[PDB]
Amino acid sequence: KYGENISKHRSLMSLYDLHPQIGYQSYIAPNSTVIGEVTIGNETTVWYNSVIRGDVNAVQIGNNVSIGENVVIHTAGSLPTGQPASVDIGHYVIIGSKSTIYSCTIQDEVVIGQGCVILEGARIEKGAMIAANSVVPPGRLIPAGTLWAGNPCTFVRNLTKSELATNIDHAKKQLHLAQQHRYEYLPYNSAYLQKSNSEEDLNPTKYDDVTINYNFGDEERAQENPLKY
Amino acid sequence: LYSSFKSQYLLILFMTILNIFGMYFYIQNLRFVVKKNKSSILNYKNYYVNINYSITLNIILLNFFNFFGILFLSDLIIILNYISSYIYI
Amino acid sequence: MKLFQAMWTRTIYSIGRMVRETGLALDRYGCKLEQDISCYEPLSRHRNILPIYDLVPTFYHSTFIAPNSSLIGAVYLGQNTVVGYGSTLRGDNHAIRVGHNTVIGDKVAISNVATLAAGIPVSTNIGNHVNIGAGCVLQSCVVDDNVTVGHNTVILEGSVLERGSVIAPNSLVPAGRLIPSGQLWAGSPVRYVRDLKEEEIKLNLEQTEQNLSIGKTHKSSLI
Amino acid sequence: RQNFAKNITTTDIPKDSHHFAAKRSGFTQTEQAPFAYNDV
Amino acid sequence: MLRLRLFDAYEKISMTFLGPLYRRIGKSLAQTGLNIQQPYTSDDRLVPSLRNIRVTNKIPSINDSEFIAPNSVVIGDVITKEGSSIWYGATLRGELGPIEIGKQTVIQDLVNIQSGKQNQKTQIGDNVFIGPNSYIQSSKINDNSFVGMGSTVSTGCNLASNAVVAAGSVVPENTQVPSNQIWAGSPAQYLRDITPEERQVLQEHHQECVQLARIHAEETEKSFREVLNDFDRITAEAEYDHESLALQ
Amino acid sequence: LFFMCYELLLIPSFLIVYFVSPSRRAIQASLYFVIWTQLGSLLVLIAISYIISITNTYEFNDLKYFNFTNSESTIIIFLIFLGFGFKAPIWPFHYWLTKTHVEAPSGFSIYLSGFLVKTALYGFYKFNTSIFIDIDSSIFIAICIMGVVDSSLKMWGQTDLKKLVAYG
Amino acid sequence: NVLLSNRKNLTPQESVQKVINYALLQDAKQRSRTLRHIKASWVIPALLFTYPAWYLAKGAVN
Amino acid sequence: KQNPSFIIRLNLLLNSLMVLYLITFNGYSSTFWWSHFKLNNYSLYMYLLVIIFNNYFLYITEKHIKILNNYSIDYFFSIINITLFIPMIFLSNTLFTFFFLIELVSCAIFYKFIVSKISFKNSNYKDNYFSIFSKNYLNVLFYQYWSSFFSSVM
Amino acid sequence: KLGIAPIQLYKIEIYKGLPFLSIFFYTTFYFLIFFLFFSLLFIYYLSALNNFFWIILLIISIIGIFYIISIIFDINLFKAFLAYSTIINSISFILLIIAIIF
Amino acid sequence: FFVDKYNFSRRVVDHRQPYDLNFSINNPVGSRVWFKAWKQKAIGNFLNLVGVHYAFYGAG
Amino acid sequence: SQTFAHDSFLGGLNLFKRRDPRFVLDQGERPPYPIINSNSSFVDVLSNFNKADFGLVLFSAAIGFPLSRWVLKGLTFSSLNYRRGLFSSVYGGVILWGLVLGFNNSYYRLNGFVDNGLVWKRKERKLNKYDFTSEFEDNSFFKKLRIRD
Amino acid sequence: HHHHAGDQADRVADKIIWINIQNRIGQFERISAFEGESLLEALQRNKVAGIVATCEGGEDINTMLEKPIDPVTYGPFCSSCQVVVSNPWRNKMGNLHYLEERNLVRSSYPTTENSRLACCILVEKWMNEMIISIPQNPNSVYEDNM
Amino acid sequence: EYLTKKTIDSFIFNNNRFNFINLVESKYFLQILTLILYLFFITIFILFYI
Amino acid sequence: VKGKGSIRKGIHGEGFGAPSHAHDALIHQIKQSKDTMDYQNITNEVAQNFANH
C-alpha cells in the first residue's frame, strides 16, 4: 500500500464537494496542507508545515492574517451551546508557531502566542492578546483589548492604544516577506521533467471521454499565484 | 461651446442645471465606496481567485484614453467632422 | 562602483528568469500540441533549500539536513550540525547562525523579529555543542555553547542563554531575559531550579554526542 | 511605526554598563529571570 | 472532401513535427536559463516519500493501517495493527526505540512519537486517540485512552485503560494515570473522575476520527490520472446548470 | 490653456481629502468641496465658452480688436465673478470651505488656504482686465463686504480653532 | 568566525559579548549588501525607461 | 454544456469580414431596390461605425465568457441577429422600410430578453422546500412587449 | 420606444430584471442606433418639419428635467443607477439636438 | 534521455479521448467503412423524417 | 502610382489601393477607368471572371484554415464528428466570402471603379490644393496603398 | 467589562442572548446572539430563513446601529430584512427613524405596526428571550437569484 | 446652511413624497395616455391662443 | 457525504441539511411516514394556509 519513491502530498486537497478558496496575494507554503471547506482572504500567509482541515465543519479566515509554522487548525463538529462549530478568524490575526485551533471564533486584530491551545467554543474578542504558553478553556470568553496568560488563562491587564497599533503594524509587515517567497517561485512547475517514463504513463489502462479542461482559457488568466495547479 | 456659438443661452442654462444635478447624482456613490476591509469580490477557479488578463489590458487602454484623451481629441474631432461633412455635400 | 556590479547581476538574473520562463512555456505548448499531460503533473513544489535573491543557505558537507526540512534565506550551518525532520529555519528577515556539533530537533521552528532595540542583535545565534529538542520555537535569541533546551520550549526575542545552562522541557523564556551559566530553569514563566552538578553536565554532553552520532548514522543510511 | 535600524555603523553609541547591574546568582524559586543588556 | 483531408493532415504534422520540436526547444531554453541565474535561484525537485524508511534491520510494518498521510514520516521499527491512522505531518521514530500501535488507534496531525532513551519501547493499545501537536516519548498507553491536543506524555508514563488526559497537558515523568480519571494542568494533577455522558462523547469523537481517517485515506491515494479527472469534474460542476444536475 | 490649467487642480485635491484625511466626516466634506467648486467651474466654463465662440481666438491680445456689447459684457462679468467667488469664497458660498477645513488633514488645509483659493484671484483678474465692462461694481463690492462682515461677526462663537482659522 | 571559534577559555560573559559583537558586525554587512542590491533595483529602471517615457510625452505634447 | 465562445468567435469573424467588404467598397451615390435603400458616404460610414463598435463589444464579451459561463448559445445567436440587422436600419431610405427593420430588430431584442438565465447554482441552502417568487422575468417581458406595441402603432 | 424622461419608468424595471451583459449590449445598441436615428430625424431625415419639431422637443426637455431632478435621488439599486445615467445623458443630447437645429 | 536532471524523452499519453474516435463515420470521406456508416445514417434520418426529406430534397 | 496588373493572380490587391477615402463617387462623377458595362446583369459579372477573382478565392481558401482553427479553439464538450463538421462549415463560409469578394471585384472592373486595363482618353486634371500626405507617403509604406498621391 | 489580575475567563453560555423565532413555515427556532451586534448578523450567522437582505446592512461609516443616529446618514437601502417584534420588546424599541419608516412602508409585501428592520436593531441585554416572527421577504433584482 | 443646501434637499424630499418607487401597470398606461393627450392639448393651445 | 454538498453525516444519522440549518418537521414526517396519515393534524402551517385562503 505504501513504499512509493516520490511523495504524493498535495498542498491543497479537496474532499468531495468541499473545495478550498484562496484570495489574491495569499501565500500557502507548499509544505503546508489545506483540506476541505476552507476559505482564506486576501494577503494571508500560511507558513511551512501547517495543517488546516475544514472537513467536519467550515473554516473561514480573514484577509491580513499570519499563521505560523507548526499550527494545526481544525473543527469539532458540534458545540454544547448549539452555536455553529466552524472556525472563524478575523482580519488582522497573528497565530504563533506550535499553536492549536479548535472550533472557535477569534475577532479582528488578535494576537495568539507561540504554543497556545485554543479549544472548542472559545470566543476571543477584538484586540485581545494571549501569551506564548497558554490554554484557553472550552467555552470561554476573552474580553476585547485584554492580555491573558497561564495554562488556565488568567487576566493580566488591559492593553493601551499603543499596543493595539503595534499589533496591527506587525500584522501589516508580513505581506512583503510572503511576496518575496512567492517571487522565488515560477508559474511553471518543472518537477515533471525530472521523472522517468513508466509503463502506465505510456499505456493507460482505460480512456475517458473529452470534457472541459481544468485550465480552459488559461492563457487569458493572469498568473497571479505561481503555486496554482 | 456649440450652444454658445448658436446663441442659445436658455439651452445653456438648462444644460447647466442638468449637469450639476447629474454630477451630484454620480459623485454621491463615491461615499458608498468606503469599506471597513477588502471586499473579496473575485471568482474562484482551481482554488484560487480568477483574475482576467485580457479584460485588465482592455481597462488599461481605456484608462489611458480616459486620463489623456484630451490630448488626442483633435484627431477624433477631425475624423468626426470629415464624416459629418458628407451629410449634405 | 559596486553598484555597477549589483546592477549587472540583477540584469543577468532577470534575463535568466526570462529565458527559463520562455522555455517552460514552450514545453507546455509542446505538451498541448502533442496531447501530452506530463507537464500537468501536480507534484510537490517544496524545496529543501530555498535561497532568497542574495541570501543563499550555506553549510558544510558534514551537515545532515532532513529532506523534510526547510532552510530558507541566509542560514549558516557549522560542521557536524544536524537539522531534524520537518524543521523550518527562516532567515529571510535576518540570518540564522548555527555552530558546530549542534543538534536541532524535528519540529523546531526558528525565525527572527523585524526590529529590536539598540545593542540587541536581531538575528539568531546558536553556539557549539548545543542540543535543541523537538517542537521548540526560537525567535531572535542567543544560545551559547553547551546549552541544552528541552522539547516544546519557546524562546523569544532578545533572550540570552549563557554557557552550560539547561532549560527544562515545556518551558518559555520571556523576551529579553538572561539565563546565567551552569543553572537549570523550568516553567512557562520560567523559574530558577538548583544549580547543575558534574554528573548532570556529563550526562547531557554524552546525550548530545549520542544524538549527533545517531544523526550522522541516519545521514549515512539516507545516502 | 518606525522601521529604521539602531545598531549604526558610523560610530559606537556612547554608553556605560556600571549602572543597572544584573544579579546572575543567588536566585530563589519564585523570582523572575534577570535582564540581559542593562547598558545606559 | 478536401476540407477534412486538410484538417486531418495538419493534426499529424502538429503531433509529430511541431510538438516535439517545441518541446525540445523549450527544454533547452529552460535548462540554459536556470544556469544563468545560479546560484541565486532554486529549481523544483522530486520530494522523497518518508512513509516507509528502513535503517539497518529496522523494517516498518504498517501495511495494516487504514490511513497513513503522505506527509507523515515513519522510520524504523514501527508496527501498526489493523485500522490504524497516522495523520498529516506526524513523525514516528522507531530507530530510537520500537513503536507499537494497536487496532483503531488514531494519531493526529503533527504528532511526534520518539523514545528519549535509546532502548525504550513506546506501546499504544487499541482504540486510543492522540490529538494534534502531541509529543510522546517512551510511554505505555493502554486501550481506549484519550490524549488531548497539544499534550506531552513523558518517558515513564503509564496510562491505564480508559484514561483521559486533557488538552494542553504535560504529564510528568514516571506518572501512572488511573482508569476513568481526567488529569489536567501544566504539571498534570488528578482533576476529576469521568461521567458517563463524557465517556460517550469521547467514544463518538474516536469513532468520527476513525471514519475521517477512512475518508482521508480514500482521498489521498488517488493516482495522477484520477486527480486530473477530479480537476476537470470540479470545473465542469462549476459550469453545470440545474438541468444538467437533474439529468445526472 | 489658462482655463484648462485652472480646471486641472480639482482631482488631486479631492483625492488628497478622500484618501489621506483621518477623520470619518471627511468623506462627505470632499463631496461638498467637489460640488461647490464644480458649480463655480461650470459658471466660469459658460463665460469662457461665450468668449471663445463670439471671438474665434485664444489669445489675450486679440481681445483688444473686438468689442463686446453691454449685454454680453454684463453676462460675462457676472458669470466670472460668481464662478471665481465660488472658489475664492464670497459670502453666500463658504459652507464647503468650512466643512473641508474642519475635516481635512492639516497639510492640505495649509495648501488650500495658503495657495489654492488664490488661483481664483489670478484668473478673474485676467478676465477682468481683458474686457471692457460698462457696469456699476456696487453689487460686487456689496457682496464682498457682506462676506467680510458675516465672516468676522461669527468669530466669537467658535470653540474649534480650525473653524476660527477658516473664518479668518 | 567567532561563533565557530572555541571560546571555552573565556568566562560566559566574555563569550556572550564576543558572540553579540560578531553577530552585530555580520548583521551590518548583510544590511549593507541588501541595501545596495535594492539601490540597484531602483537605479536600473530609471536608465532603461526614462528616455522612452520622455519620448512618449514629447510626441504627445509637442 | 456547450461553451458559446466559438459561437461568439464565429460572429466576430463574420462581422470582421463585413468590415472588409466595406473597406474595398466601390460604387455611386444612389438608391437601390426601388429607392428603398440609400448608398452614400454618410450612411456607409454609420454602417462601418456600428459594425466596428459591435465587434469591439463582442471581443470583450468573448474575453469575459471564459471566467464564468452563465449564458446559453441562443443568447449569442440573438446577439448575432441583432448585430447583423441594425446597420441596415442605418441604411434606410423611407419610413416604411425603417419601421419594418425596427420591428425586426425589436423582435430580435425580445428574443435576447427571453433567453436570460433564470435559476442559478448558489450557496443558499435555506430555500429548499419553500416557494420564492422572483417576478423580474415577467416584468421585463411585459414592459418591453407593451412599449413595442405602443411605438409600433403610433 | 426609447424610454425617455417622461416615460422613463419602465426602463428601470427592465434594467432591474436584466443581467449585466444584457445591459452592456442593450446600451451599445440603444446609443449607437436608436438614439442616433432619433437625432437624425430632426437633424437630417425630416429637417423640413423643424419649425414644428423644436417647440415640442423644448417642452419635453423641460418636463423631463423637472421630472427627474428629484426622482433620481430616491433610488437604491445599481441597475436603476445605470438606467438613470443613460436617461440623463439622453436628455442632455436632446438639448444638444435643439441647439443644433437652430 | 536525462540531460542535467531533465528528461528530454518525457511522455505521458492523454487518457481523455473522444468516444467518437475510431468510429466508421470519422474515416475519410469516400472510404468503404465511411460509406457504410453514411448509408446507415442516411436511412435512419429518412425514416424519422419522411416528409421533411421529401420536401427539401425533391424541391432542391 | 502604379497598381497591380489585372487579369492576374494579384489583381485583387488593387481593391486595397484608393485615391480618396470616399466610399462611393458622386452621382455625376466619372469613374477612374473607362466603363465596359454600366448596366451589368448577373451573368455579365460571371463572364467577366478571370485570374484575379480566382486568386481572391485561392487567398480565401488559404487564410480560412487558421481562422477556422481559431474559431474551433472555443469548443468544449464536443465529439470528433461535431468538431469536423463545424470546421467544414467555417471553412465553407470563408470560401463563400472569397467568392463574394471575387464577384464584387469583377463587378467593379465592369463598372470601371478599379483598374480594368483601360485608360481614359482625356485625363481629369486635378490641382492638389490641400496636401498633407504626399511627403508622408513618400517616406513610408503607405505610398503603396495610394494612387496618384 | 471588569476584571482583576488572576481572574478566570467568563463563560460564553452566560453571555448568550436568546432569540425565539416563528418561521415562515410556522415552526419555532431558538437563536444565540451577543450584545453590540446587529440582529441581521446573528440571524445570518445562525442561518435563519425568510430574510433576503439585498443590501446586506447598508453602508459602513454612518450606520443606523450607532446609538446616536448621525443626521447625514442614508438609512437602510433595501428594506428586505423585516421582522415582527412582540409587544413588550417592540414597545421598548421606541419610535422608528423617519428613513427606516419610509423604507418599511414602501415595501412590496404587506407590513404591520410591529415591523422592524433587522439591520437597524442593535442587540441589547433586555432583548433576551425576545419573540419575533419572520414571514418571507420580497425579492428585488435579478442578482437576488444568483 | 438652510437657504443654500436644505432648501434643495427638502424640495427633493417633498417631491419624492409623491413618487411610487415601484412601477405598476396601471400607472404606466395612464402615464402614456396622459403624455399623449396633454402634449397634444398644450401644443394646440399654443397654436391657437398663444 | 459524497454528492450531497455541505450536508454532513453524524453518528446514528445521515443528516438532511447543511450544518446550523433548521430541521423541517414536515419533511421529517414525509421521510418517516411515506403515505400514512392517521389524522389531518392541524399544525401552524396548515392553520396559516387556511387563514391565507
Ligand SMILES: CCCCCCCCCCCCCCCCCC(=O)OC[C@H](COP(=O)(O)OCCN)OC(=O)CCCCCCCCCCCCCCCCC
Ligand atoms: C514596422 C513598420 C513597417 C512599415 C509600416 C507597415 C504598415 C503595414 C500595416 C498598415 C497597412 C495595412 C492596411 C490598412 C489597414 C487595415 C484597414 C483599416 O484599419 O482600415 C481602417 C478603416 C478604413 O476605412 P476607410 O478607408 O475610411 O473606408 C471608407 C472607404 N474605404 O477606417 C475606419 O474604419 C474609419 C474610422 C472609423 C471611426 C473612427 C472614429 C470614431 C471612433 C473613435 C473611438 C474608437 C474607440 C473604440 C471603438 C471600437 C473599435 C475598437
Ligand code: FES
Ligand atoms: S438588509 Fe437591507 S434594509 Fe436591512
